[PDB]
Amino acid sequence: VRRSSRKSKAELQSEERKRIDELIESGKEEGMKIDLIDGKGRGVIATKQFSRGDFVVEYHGDLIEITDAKKREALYAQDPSTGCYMYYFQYLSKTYCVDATRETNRLGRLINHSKCGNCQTKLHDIDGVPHLILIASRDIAAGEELLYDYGDRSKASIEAHPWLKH
Amino acid sequence: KRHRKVLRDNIQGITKPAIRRLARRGGVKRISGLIYEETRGVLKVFLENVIRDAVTYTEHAKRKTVTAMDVVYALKRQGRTLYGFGG
Amino acid sequence: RDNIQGITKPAIRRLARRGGVKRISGLIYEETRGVLKVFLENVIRDAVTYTEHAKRKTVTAMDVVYALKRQGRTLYGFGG
Amino acid sequence: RKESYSIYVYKVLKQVHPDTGISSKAMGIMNSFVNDIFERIAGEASRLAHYNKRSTITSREIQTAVRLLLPGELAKHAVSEGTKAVTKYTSA
Amino acid sequence: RKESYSIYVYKVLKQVHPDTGISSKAMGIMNSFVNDIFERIAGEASRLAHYNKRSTITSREIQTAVRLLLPGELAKHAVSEGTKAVTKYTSAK
Amino acid sequence: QGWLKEIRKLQKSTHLLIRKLPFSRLAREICVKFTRGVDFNWQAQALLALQEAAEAFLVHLFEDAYLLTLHAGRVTLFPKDVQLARRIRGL
Amino acid sequence: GWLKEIRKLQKSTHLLIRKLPFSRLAREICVKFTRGVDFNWQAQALLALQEAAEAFLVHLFEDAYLLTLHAGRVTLFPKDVQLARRIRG
Amino acid sequence: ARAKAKTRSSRAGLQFPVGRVHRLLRKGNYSERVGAGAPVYLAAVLEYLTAEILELAGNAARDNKKTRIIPRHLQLAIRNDEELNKLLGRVTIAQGGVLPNIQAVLLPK
Amino acid sequence: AKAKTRSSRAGLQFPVGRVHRLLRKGNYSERVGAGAPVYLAAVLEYLTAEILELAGNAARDNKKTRIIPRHLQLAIRNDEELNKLLGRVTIAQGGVLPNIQAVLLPK
DNA sequence: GATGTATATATCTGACACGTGCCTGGAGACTAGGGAGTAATCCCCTTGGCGGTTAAAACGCGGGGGACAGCGCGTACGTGCGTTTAAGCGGTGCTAGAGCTGTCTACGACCAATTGAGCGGCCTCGGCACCGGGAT
DNA sequence: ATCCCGGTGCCGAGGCCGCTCAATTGGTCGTAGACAGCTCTAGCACCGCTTAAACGCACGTACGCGCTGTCCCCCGCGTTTTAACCGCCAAGGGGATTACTCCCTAGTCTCCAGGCACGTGTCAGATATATACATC
């Protein structure tokens, strides 16, 4: 009757993966409101007791190859009122690009750039296709704004955006 | 001026020529191309073990600085006794 | 003399077969007798040291179990 | 007066599989396993107490030794069991 | 105030190689080596004491701990040196 | 088959694969090389502990040196494989 | 070209992975065994951890290359580092 | 000695002996002193580990459709478990046999 | 009266006193014999004399006068007994023994 | 169609699970002291940031070195079988030697006194590193 | 390319002086363990008999190994680019130390109960044969 419930590491990783997958494919977006920030533009405040590694959002968009990735950012940058919505990542000797300029009911594209923020982006591959996740790498309380790192150090970009270094 | 968005991994900081120099010191005349991700995985596993035990030796001493003796005792526990850091 | 040849060829072959080996080069037999003799030399040196220190003359089971535990090969089933 | 854990392993067995016995050789093996894990945990707690210049082995030292010696889930569940037992013991 | 075997390793160095120094890093390595070999020999001697239900670490226990931990010729020569030193220590009073 | 039935049969039993008396004589011949020419009695369970250890060791040694000779393309265990499986472990 | 590097490295003794990327790696692994609270790694402990990791990786490549000279190869594949570990422990 | 005594194992809810574990911690020279919660913690851990192993050993013994746990079943439980095998890696279990594993490259085609 | 250290009674250079104190306060046994610290100190001095002799040799082979970690790693890994003793031990800043498999040299 | 292997029945046998006397150790209550928990202080030394520099990494490209698949030879391992042999088991014997015990004697813990070795700060100098040149 | 040789240089090591703490000495006691003695267990030896296992031989064929080819993928090279790093500085957290007190554990003694050896009923599983089926 006294039975151990030890949850072997294989089962732990499997249930964690299924948890990420179901939370992604459900898109609850529990407790994040978009408001105004004093100068930076918009802001998505998180209202949950976030901690190490807990799920926050998904940077949903359109996934493409590298040959068009290195081009679409420059081609959409010709519109000076496009903000910043497309995300690159190198994976399996291949770069992709998260085409997310078109507004969708997800809250990934709604985040701005910082180096002193509160979240950092990871990679999750739901059946091959890598969805770009964002989890809280540290303890965040209810009422803080979503803020993660874009990781790009284009020299012209850092000249143009002194708030990138912030 | 729109900027793109990328990331880093802090394990890709164990660069490719660093694994080449480690191999060469180990005597490896000619290295495959897939040994790099395998070696970063091996390194992350080793560090996970040694750092779990260093952080335990610290958290037990009610400290917050992972001293050199914490790491030396973590290695001594794993059986990797390390000479030269105040043992 | 030649008591290592008492570790017969089919005994080494049955040990291998248990270990999973499918075919066995006829030279593995002398190699395995050498390996076994080295293992026994170590374990029996430590067992007989544990005895000689205990001022005894019969190598007990705990002497050998402590010899194995010292080499790092803890053996369950004979005390401890 | 030979010391063993035979009757307590019998108790734990009859608590887990109430309709299962255990041979004498397996009894000796479980005895050796308990002795060995005890020796490990006690030696590690001793090392911790010596490292931190303490004199007493306490539940803190035993918990840290358990966390060092047992791998992940075993350590988590063993720490749970021991903490529960210590709280119950100091309550009663 | 921290103790270490620096001055003694240095005396032994001036014994075996009079015209030779030892860098501070190799000094730390010899300190750690002496500490580790001491811990091995004394731990094995403690274990040899408790295995025989006795309480005193005597020269007997240390000789057997050496004969256990050190390989063949190291063991024989270290035991020779230890016995020499013990007889010299009990002879002179 | 033939080797496959012997393998499935031996990996599933728990016997002592070396005869008890030849291993007894071997351990008593090595127990004399140390403590030159003084016959220590051997507690009949010390020989069992020693044989259990030597057999678990040799079986693991062949199980580790057969990963080196499926790795080397062979199927036949060679002395090279055993020497390398020992030279990797640290022996 | 490779031999003027093996001889050059087996003869030196300095560290091989850079100090700052390894420090960031060790601090990224230490932040998941404390559940997100970070510890001030004493700068002499990063060196001990790095010396242990380099000596370990170098011994691992010595054994792996004992295995890749066994299979007739000269190249060091990942199926080797993966077996010099499944043998070693 | 009034107020009839209940064993410390009973007070803590364990099956292993808190008393005997305390006595072993004392006359073993692990430290001059020994906490009051140290035997209880260590005995709870020992009981947990032994339950973890006897559970898997009984599972193996009933998979083999037997009702006596034997050394072979203990070796099965331990080596087949992922973490007990790491805790007991250096450990030979007398008359424990080896795990049935013929490398898949050996089978006939 | 006038005293002389036990390290001098035994003719050692290592401290019989510090070794005795370490055996006591280390909780190795409820007691410690009188010959135990002398024996342990003699063994420690012998091992260190061995190591430092081989390290001085490896330093003179490099035409240097300081013993550095690399020289200790050479002195250890080249001697068979010590390498068997200090087998699990990594010696920081110690490098590796130059050993390129003879299969690799150009024919 | 052997040849072995999965499934049931009969059984019986040594091993296991259980009831009992007792005795040795586990629990309770109490006292004392010293170990350590807590608070406060000081300053070490860790973290963070910036500029610049440059060493090193990244990337791309050619090529040729090596991995891998295929193949043929021949040798050496597995299998099968009749023979030889040595392990194994059961007896008895017996006796050395392990385990236990009581005596007592030597030896180690403890404690006061002391004094000198060693540890830390100061200071000098040379070993080994570096920058440049000639020879192999 | 790389070693042998000059000359600078620098920084770390080797020696010197003042304090302090811990190593030495001496005396006492109590207890551990050395020793002599005794019991009785179990280890060694032997020997007859069984017979299971080893062994030696022969044969074939599975496999190791050497050779060849081709295809691709590491390596070396050159150029750009990037981020490690070193110095410098500033801050401030938290490590290390210390003093106080209190509470937690060792020691002691008395009580008593649980667990251990011992004897015993019984049954789980290992054979043995028969029945049915899997397999090369």
Author numbering:
A (entry chain K): 187 to 352
B (entry chain F): 16 to 102
C (entry chain B): 23 to 102
D (entry chain H): 33 to 124
E (entry chain D): 33 to 125
F (entry chain E): 45 to 135
G (entry chain A): 46 to 134
H (entry chain G): 10 to 118
Original paper wording:
SET8 (also named PR-SET7, SETD8, or KMT5A) is a histone methyltransferase that is solely responsible for H4K20 monomethylation in cells. Intriguingly, SET8 primarily promotes H4K20 monomethylation in the nucleosome, although it also possesses the ability to methylate the nucleosome-free H4K20 residue. In the complexes with H3 and CENP-A nucleosomes, SET8 specifically binds the nucleosomal acidic patch via an arginine anchor, composed of the Arg188 and Arg192 residues. Mutational analyses revealed that the interaction between the SET8 arginine anchor and the nucleosomal acidic patch plays an essential role in the H4K20 monomethylation activity.
The nucleosome containing the centromeric histone H3 variant, CENP-A, is a preferred substrate for SET8 because the H4 N-terminal tails in the CENP-A nucleosome are more accessible than those in the canonical H3 nucleosome. SET8 can efficiently monomethylate the H4K20 residue in the NCP containing CENP-A (NCPCENP-A). This may happen because, in the NCPCENP-A, the N-terminal tails of H4 adopt the outward conformation, which is preferred for the H4K20 monomethylation by SET8. We prepared the SET8–NCPCENP-A complex, and the cryo-EM structure was determined at 3.00 Å resolution. Consistent with the previous structural studies with CENP-A NCPs, the DNA regions of the nucleosomal entry/exit sites are somewhat ambiguous because of the flexible nature of the DNA in the NCPCENP-A. The structure of the CENP-A–specific RG loop is also different from the corresponding loop of H3 in the NCP. However, the overall structure of the SET8–NCPCENP-A complex is quite similar to that of the SET8–NCP complex. Therefore, the structural characteristics of the NCPCENP-A may not affect the specific NCP binding by SET8, except for its preferred H4 N-terminal tail conformation. The EM densities of the Arg188 and Arg192 residues are also clearly visible in the SET8 N-terminal extension bound to the NCPCENP-A, and both residues are captured by the acidic patch. In the NCPCENP-A, the outward conformation of the H4 N-terminal tail is preferred.
